[PDB]
C-alpha cells in the first residue's frame, strides 16, 4: 500500500495519537534505555572548568500506540521532519553550560519504529560540560569527567532512564586526545535528583582521563632542573668575583620566580598547593640557599688565615652537598608522587 | 475520560481562556511566589564585572480560570509545547547582560496545574549578571552579588513578585567555587523600581562571596616577600663591590615594579588604592630604600678613617633595621586588614 | 464587556486596521517622541572603538485608528505577543555594530494605549555602539559618545523623530563606571541624514565621559617617576665603577623602553602623539641623557689633574641639574595638560 | 481608494504575481543596478586576514508585473514585512566569512515601487570580508580590499549585476580609520565566475587603504634607533672595563632580538621578508657587529705597545664608522622604500 | 503554459509527491554523486586542532518522481524557497565542530531539475573541521586534513554517497594560504561507518598541506643561531674578567630557555618531542656547555704556570671545537630532517 498514507494513518489526527501524552499515561513508568557514541572528545580547559564533547545520543523506548502489524516491514526508518509530532523524552544534561544541535545540511536526527512499538531515536549533540577538577597532584593527576542525563519535567513515577546492557558508551576508533589518555573502562552509576518539585530520574557516566607528563617535563621540570644546575655552577667560581657570583645568583632566583609564576598561567585560581607548586617552591628554596651560601662565604672571607680556609671549606662541602640534597629530594618526590596516585 | 480532550476543554477556544489576560483582570494583583535552585555558579570575572549562573527558576501563581474538579488527579503535569497558550508572568532580570534558555534535547520547562488553579512553572536559565564590585581590600574582600527579578510590563497594581516562605534560594549539593566560598545565608530584600512609566514589582536576592587568599599568597605575597629578603641580602655583601650591590638593587627594584604591574593584570582599571597595591608600594619603597642606603654608603665611603667606620655602621644598623621595620609593617598590615573586614 | 472581544474589535480583520499603513497615511508626518533609560553602561574598549549600553527605549506616538471611547479605562496595558499586529516606527541605530533584544523569560516589551490613541512602546535593548575617540590628551581626556536614532525606511515627509521635553535621557540610580565619570548633562541635537534615497529623520544624544587618572598614575606615571629617580641614583655612585654605572644606565633605559612599549598595549594603533607618549619620550630622553652624561664623564676621566676635577664637576652639576630640569618639565607638563582640557 | 486593497490587488493571489518567477521569465536577463553606502569601516585584522564593514546595499531592477497606473502616487514606499512576497535577486558576497542582517527594532529594510515597475530595495548589512594581503613592504604598504557581489543561483542568461552610473560607492561623511587612510577613488571591475554549473554574474569593487607610519615609528623604528645608539655608546667606554662593555653589548643584542620577535606579534605567519624584518635584521647585525668589535679589541689588547695603539685605533675608527654606515643604510633604506610604492 | 502551474503540478498535493519518501523507496539505493568547490581555505589553528573552510557542496541524484516531458526546457532552475518541499539527502560532516549556512541576502542555495529527473543541489557552507595533527617534525611537516561526508539517518541499503568522476574537488583560482601550500592532488577514499544502528555511507577526501619554513627560520631558528654565536663570543674574552664571562653565559642560557619556552606558545600540549624541541634542546646544551667550559677554565686557573697554559689551551681548543661541533650537528640535523619527510 501507499507509504504516504501509512505515515498519517499510524499516527496523527486520524488515529488520535497525541504527542503530549506518555506511552503509558496511567500505569507503569516508561523505561528509556540510553547509549552514547563519542564522535570527538577534547577542548578540556582547566581555566573554564569544562570540556567539549560531540556525541550521538540514542534513546530506545516502547510506545504501544506506534505498534503496527499490517505493514510487512519489521523495522522502518522515518524522516526527521515528523519528529515534532511524536512523543520524545525530555532528556537534558545537568552539568552542561552550553549545547546545540547540528543542522549542517539537514537535521542530524534518526528515528526507527519497530513492529512491536519500539522507538529508536538517535541525535547528534555538541556539549560543553562542566567538570569539577581536583587540581592537587596537578601534573600527575587523573581527572574524572561526569555526564548526567536527567528528566527535567517527568517524575520517577512517570519516566525512568536506564543504561543499555550491551555497549552503553562506545568511542570512535582512533579518537585520541593531545593532553590525556581516556581509559577503556567507563563507570556507570545511578544519580537521582531530589528537589522540592519531586524525584527525577538520572543516569551518570564518568570518564577517567590521565594527563601525560611529556609536555610538563619539557616545559616546566627540565628548565627548572637546568636553573638549579645553573645555581650549582656558582660553587665552582672563585671567591673574590663578587659581581659574577651575585649576578648569577640574582638572575637564577629571578628566573626561578618567573617560572614559578608562569607555571600557573593556564590554570584557575585554586588555593591549595599542587605538585608543580611544591616543585617550584623547593627549586626556589635551593637557588635562594645557594645565594645565601655565597653571602655567608663573602661575609666570612672579609672578617680579617682561618677565615679563608673556613670559607673555602664551605664551598667545598657545598659542591657535594647541594646536588646530593637535591638528588634526595628528587628521589623522595618522584616516589611519593608515583605511589599516592593508585 | 480521554486525556487529549481535557487539554483543550480546560483551556483554549472552546473554554474561552485567553493567554493575554491576567488571572484576575479587574481586581487584586496576581501574587507570584518565586524560588531558585542554583545548578552551577562560577565564571566570576572582575574585568567584565559579571558572573555566570545556571538556575532553575520556579514561579507559583493562582489562576482561577485553570481550576478543574472533574478530573480525579489532584495535581497534573503538562508538556512544555503548550506553554505558549497559557498566561505566564513577564519576569526579567534587571542586571543581566546576556541570557538564554536551554533546548538541549527539548525545552527545559516544567508546568504543573493543581485542582484549585495553582500553577507551578519551572524553567532552566543561564544568566550573565553584572556585579558592581568594591575592589578595595582586594585580596581580603567579601563581594556581594545581586539578582533582581522584575516585571517589565505589569505595574504593581497588576502583578506582585514575592519570595517563597520556605526555601527561597537553594543551592546544588557539592557546588564549590575555585576562587570563592559562597556563604550559607542569602539576603532577600524588596527592591522596587520607579520609572516615568509606573511602579514595577521587584524582588532582590544577594549572595556573599569570600575570596580565598591561597592563590594570592602563592602568586603575589610570597614572591614579593622573597624579593624584599633578596634586597636584604645586599647588606651582607662587602662595601667595595659596587657592581654586585648596584646590580642586585637594580634587579630587585625592576622585578618589584614588574610584579606591581602584573598584580593588576586581571583587574579592571579602577582608580582607588587596594590592599595589594599598598603592599606592592611598600615593598617597592623598601627595595628602593635599600638601594638608596647603598648609595649613601658608597657616597660616604669615598669622602677621603671615620668615614669607613661610619659607613660600616650604616650597614650594621641597616642589617637589623630593615627586617625589623618590615616586620612591624607586616604585623600592622595583617592586623588592620584582618580587623576592618568584619 | 469581555476583554477578549475588545482586543480584536478595536483592531484586526473586523475593524480593518492595517499594520503596514501609517497612522496618517496621506497628511502630516507622524511625530514620535523618544526617551531612554540607561540600565547599565560600560565595556568601553578603546581598541575596538565601541561601548556597550543597555537601555529601555520608549517611543510615544499618536495613532488615531487605535482610539477608543466605549471602554471605561483611560489607559490600558497590552501583551507583547500582539505587537506584531500594530504599526511601529522603524527606528534603528546608525552607529551600532551589534545589538539584540532580550527574551530572558518573555519578550521584554511594553505597550500602552490611551483613550485618545496615544501609543507608548517601551523595549529593552543591548547596544554595541561605535565611538570615534580622539586619543590625544589620552590620560587626561574627555570622550564624547554619541547615539543616533534614525528611521531606515520612512522619509521626513512621513515620519519625524523628536526628543521628549521632560526627561529625555535618564540614568539608573547608582550606575557607576570603573574607568569614567558620566556627566550629569547630556547634549541633544538634531542629526539629519541625506542620502540619494531621501531625507531621513534622526535624533542624536551625546554623552561626555571623563577618564580617571588614578589607574594611570599607579600603572604608568609613578613607575616611570621611579625609573627616572633610579637613573638619578647613578650620579651618587663613584666614577671608577664602570660596570655598576653602565649596568644601571642600561637597565634603566631598557625598562623605560619596555614601559613605553607597554603603555600602548590596550590602545588602537593611532598615529598621533598622546600625553602618555610625550611623558614616556621625555622620561626616556632623561634616562638616556643620564647614561650619556656618564659616558662623557668616563671619556673625560681617562684623557691623561684638571680632567679629574672637571669630570667630578660634571657629576656635581648633574646632581642638582637633572632633578631641577625634571621638576621644571613636570610643572610645565601638568600645567599645560590641566589647562587645555577646558 | 483604500490603501489596504491596493497592496493585495497589485500583487498576490488575486493578481497572480509569483515571487518564484523572474520579471522576464523567458526573455532578456533582468538587469540589477547596485550601489553601496559605507556606514562604517574598520576592524582590519591582519592575523585573521579580514575586515568588517557596515553597508547599505541598494538594488534597483525593473519588474513589469509590479507596474501600476491607477494609483496617483508616482513612487510609493512599502513595509518590510511584505518583502517575503516579492521577487528579489539572490545576491551574495563571494569573499565573506560571516554576515548578518540588523533587526535592532524592526527589519532594516526599504522597498520602493515606481509607476513603471522600477523596484528599489535597500538593506543594511554587516560583512566580515576576507582580504588577501601582500605583507611585503609591511609598514609602508597600500592594501587592496575587494568586495564581490555575485548571483548564487541565476546564470548570466537570467540575471546580470551592474554598477550604478552615478555614485556607485559612497562613504559616510567623517568616516575615518585609526590605522589607514581610505582613498577617494574606488575601482570598479567586472568579475565573472565560471564553474561547472554555469556562468554567474559578478561585480567587484576594490578599495585602496594606505597604512600610516606614525604608530610604527613610535613603536618599532624609534626604539630600535635608540637601541642602535645605545650600542654606539659602547665605543666611548674605556677598554679595560670588560663587564661594562660586554654587559652593554649583551643587553643590546637581547633587547634587539626581543624587539624583532615582538614586531611580528600581531601578524600572520607569512614566510617572506618584510620591510620591518629587514630593518630589524640590519639593526641586529649592527649591534652584533658592535659586540664583535669589542671582542676584537679585547682580543688584540691582551696579545702581549703597538697592540694598545692598534686596539685604540679600532675604537677611534669605529666611533666615526658605525654612525656613518648606519646613516648610509638609513638613507638608502628610506629612499628605496619611498620609491617602490608608486 | 503558465510557469506558476507547473511548479505545483509537477510536485505537491496535486501530484502526490512526498518529500519524506526516497526516490526509489523499495528497490535499489539512491546514488548521490557529490563534488565540492573550495571558495576559501585557512584559519588552521594547531591549538584548537581544527581548520575553517568555505565550500560549495553539489549533490546530484536521480528522482524519477520529478521527471517531466511536457515542458520544453531540458533543464530548469528553481527558487530556494521550495527546497523544503523536495526530498534531499541527509548529508552531514563527521568531523565538524561547528557549521552554518549563509543567508546574507537570500538563501545561498541552487536547485536544478533535468528532464529525466536528475536533481542538482548546490549549497554554500562554512565548516570548522577537526584535524588530527601529527606534530612530530613540526616545522618540516606535511599535514593531512580530512573531510568525511556521511548519511546520518539512511543505511547503505537506502542511500549511497559517491564522488563525481570528473572534478571531484575543485579549488578557487588564486586561493593561497599564509602558512601552507595546498597540494594539487587530493586523495579520495571510501570511509564507511559501522555502528550498532547500522551501516552508513561515507565518502572521505583528504588534503595535503606543507608548512613553509620562512616564518620559523625568521622567528625561531636564526635567533637561536645568533644566541649560539653569542655564546661563542665568550671564548675570545680574557680569562680574568669573571663578571663579563659569567654574565654573558647566564644571559645566553636564560634567553635560550625563554626562546625554548616561547617556541611552543601557539601549540597544543603534546607530549612527544618535535624537531623544534630537539633544536632548542641542543642549542641550550651548547650554551650550557659553553658556560660549563668557562667554569672549568676558572676552576683550573685558580689552582695555584702549567695551570695557566692548560686553561688557555682549553679556550684555544674550544674556539675551534664549538663551531665545528655545531656545524656537524647542523649538517646532520638538516640532512635527517630533509630525508625522512619523503
Ligand atoms: C519499567 O521498568 C520497571 C522496572 O523494571 C517496571 O516495573 C515492574 O513491572 C513489572 C511488570 O508488571 C512488575 O511485575 C514489577 O513489580 C514492577 N517493578 C517495579 C519496581 O515497579 C515497569 O513495568 C516498566 N514499565 C514499562 C512500561 O514497561
Ligand atoms: C495578592 O496579595 C495581596 C497582599 O497579600 C492581596 O491583597 C489583600 O487582599 C486581602 C483579601 O481581600 C485584603 O483583605 C487586603 O486588604 C489586601 N491587601 C492589600 C494591601 O491590597 C491580594 O488580594 C492578593 N491577590 C490575589 C489574587 O490573591
Ligand atoms: C507633527 O509635527 C509637525 C510639526 O510640529 C506638525 O506640522 C505642523 O502642523 C500644524 C497643524 O496643522 C500646522 O499648523 C503647521 O504648519 C505644521 N508645521 C509644519 C512645519 O509642517 C504635524 O502636523 C505633526 N503631525 C501630526 C500627525 O500631529
Ligand atoms: C539587460 O541589459 C542587456 C544589455 O544592455 C539588454 O540586452 C540588450 O537588449 C536590447 C533591447 O532589445 C537589444 O537590442 C540588445 O541586442 C541586447 N544586448 C544583448 C547583449 O543582449 C537586455 O535587454 C536588458 N534586459 C532587460 C529586461 O531590460
Ligand atoms: C546505485 O548504484 C548501484 C551500484 O552501481 C546500483 O546497483 C546495481 O544496479 C544494477 C542495475 O540493476 C544491477 O545490475 C547491479 O547488480 C547492482 N549492483 C549492486 C551491487 O547492487 C543501483 O541500482 C543504483 N541505484 C539506482 C537507483 O540507480
Residue numbers in the entry:
A (entry chain B), B (entry chain C), C (entry chain D), D (entry chain E), E (entry chain A): 8 to 311, 386 to 423
Wording from the paper:
The subtype GlyRα3 expressed in nociceptive sensory neurons of the spinal dorsal horn is a key regulator of physiological pain perception. To understand the mechanism of two such endogenous modulators, Zn2+ and protons, we have used cryo–electron microscopy to determine structures of full-length human GlyRα3 in various functional states.
We first look at the effect of different concentrations of glycine (submaximal and saturating levels) on the distribution of the functional states, and then we examine the effect of Zn2+ and acidic pH on this distribution.
